[PDB]
Design a protein around this ligand. Structure first.
Ligand code: MG
Ligand code: MG
Ligand code: MG
Ligand code: MG
Ligand code: ZN
Lengths: 136, 141, 38, 94
RNA sequence: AGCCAGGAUGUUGGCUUAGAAGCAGCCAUCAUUUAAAGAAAGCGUAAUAGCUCACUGGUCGAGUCGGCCUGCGCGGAAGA
């Protein structure tokens, strides 16, 4: 699973996920899986999908992962009042705006890259679409 | 040459007629005999050799036994003694295993006056060239 | 028959049909393929 | 050989360009040379399919604004964030 | 689209094969008769297989196929 190896601070303000996505072009492979919606991907999420696609293609071609967690999420357990301090980090997410390319890949037939991305997509909380490399 | 009316093929080698170990019970059942599998067997087996496998017709109508004129020994049979290994596969493609040559198996399958495809006889040359490449040997053509 | 949100062709003998307001899968080859409620 | 038709833009800025795209035309621009740049407006579908052919980005295309013919090369696109469509184009008058 | 034909030859394919003859096996995926036909599509036998398919002739006689941008709908939908 992904997460910072280390960070300047344990916890972050909740923040908001407004805006459109930077990193919108298949810029490392031939095909990409792009975010069409807004939301959070969790490490397990990213990984569940990563597996899905990696196995679809077998030990073939290459893969990149453009998004990376770095956003720590805390929770309060049950039977606890409000307050008395910010909760305990339990996992990491990456904030996803629409447009984000999520995973790229090459070294495989388009059709396969599609199948593979279709599969990983099913593991994802947000809508996605198949994209392709472009001149310019 | 009309339709479906008796014919099979489950043997081992012409140098042991009728075998019970490999084919056994299933060589005489439908107007076909496990005993008579030798009379028309050696109607010209030994007349040539007992060191080559050959399957054959059956042809039946309800008659006592069965009439089945024969033809060729395959071309995979003539790669054990006359063109390399006796196993065959080896490690079919991890390494080239064994090797052959264009001259080897030319005449061995050009003799085929009872089987083959290619009015051009150079054609059914390469139309036997593969029953050696089925084990992925090596091209010394 | 199998009933559920996503219903799909499974064989080449599968067919999709709508009867009343209801998506159904109909397979001429395999009863296990018969679906409803798509 | 690639031929793109284009009106010039009777107005500019965000409101107008949005209104353009809402209407299935998108805005673009031409510059380079000693002439002033030209606020252009292209029809979406037509320019789209054109740019699908790679030749579009390498070849010298010819834009056509009221009768006159401008010789250009595609310089930059701004594509939609996730849809098969163009939001803007830079053309280099060359 | 439909209906008539064919779907062959190295080759029953050599094959860590007890038996496989396409078939979980085994690796390759080459080769000839052709209009075309896969060491491979199939329910699948003790192994044959019997029987439809990917493919290509005939028939028929004008449209047909499915991705893109989009409007409105449909299923997904169980409570006192
Ligand atoms: Mg009813
Ligand atoms: Mg405004
Ligand atoms: Mg037709
Ligand atoms: Mg609905
Ligand atoms: Zn079915």
């Amino acid at each position: 699973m992904l997460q910072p190896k280390r960070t300047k601070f344990r916890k972050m303000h909740k923040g908001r996920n407004r805006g459109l996505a930077q990193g919108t072009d298949v810029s490392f492979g031939s095909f990409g899986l792009k975010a069409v919606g807004r939301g959070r991907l969790t490490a397990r999420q990213i990984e569940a999908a990563r597996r899905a696609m990696t196995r679809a293609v077998k030990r073939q071609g290459k893969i990149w992962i453009r998004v990376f967690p770095d956003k720590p999420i805390t929770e309060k357990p049950l039977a606890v009042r409000m307050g008395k301090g910010k909760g305990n980090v339990e996992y990491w997410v990456a904030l996803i705006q629409p447009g984000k390319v999520l995973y790229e890949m090459d070294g495989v037939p388009e059709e396969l890259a599609r199948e593979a991305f279709k599969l990983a997509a099913a593991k994802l909380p947000i809508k996605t679409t198949f994209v392709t490399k472009t001149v310019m | 040459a009309k339709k479906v009316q008796a014919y099979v093929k489950l043997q081992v080698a012409a140098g042991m007629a009728n075998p019970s170990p490999p084919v056994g019970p299933a060589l005489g059942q439908q107007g076909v005999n496990i005993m008579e599998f030798c009379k028309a067997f050696n109607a010209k087996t030994d007349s040539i050799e007992k060191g080559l496998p050959i399957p054959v017709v059956i042809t039946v109508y309800a008659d006592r036994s069965f009439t089945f004129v024969t033809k060729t020994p395959p071309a995979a049979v003539l790669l054990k003694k006359a063109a390399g290994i006796k196993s065959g596969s080896g490690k079919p493609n991890k390494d080239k295993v064994g090797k052959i040559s264009r001259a080897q198996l030319q005449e061995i399958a050009q003799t085929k006056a009872a089987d083959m495809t290619g009015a051009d006889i150079e054609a059914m040359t390469r139309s036997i060239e593969g029953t050696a490449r089925s084990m992925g040997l090596v091209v010394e053509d | 028959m199998k009933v559920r949100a996503s219903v799909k062709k499974l064989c080449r003998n599968c067919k999709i049909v709508k009867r009343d307001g209801v998506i159904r899968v109909i397979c001429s080859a395999e009863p296990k393929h018969k679906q409803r409620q798509g | 050989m690639f031929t793109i038709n284009a009106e010039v833009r009777k107005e500019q800025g965000k409101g107008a360009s949005r209104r353009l795209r809402a209407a299935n035309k998108f805005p673009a621009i031409i510059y380079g040379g000693k002439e002033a740049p030209l606020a252009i407006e292209l029809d979406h579908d037509k320019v789209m399919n054109m740019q699908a052919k790679a030749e579009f980005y390498s070849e010298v295309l010819t834009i056509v604004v009221d009768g006159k013919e401008i010789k250009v090369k595609a310089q930059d696109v701004q594509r939609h964030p996730y849809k098969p469509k163009l939001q803007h184009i830079d053309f280099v008058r060359a």
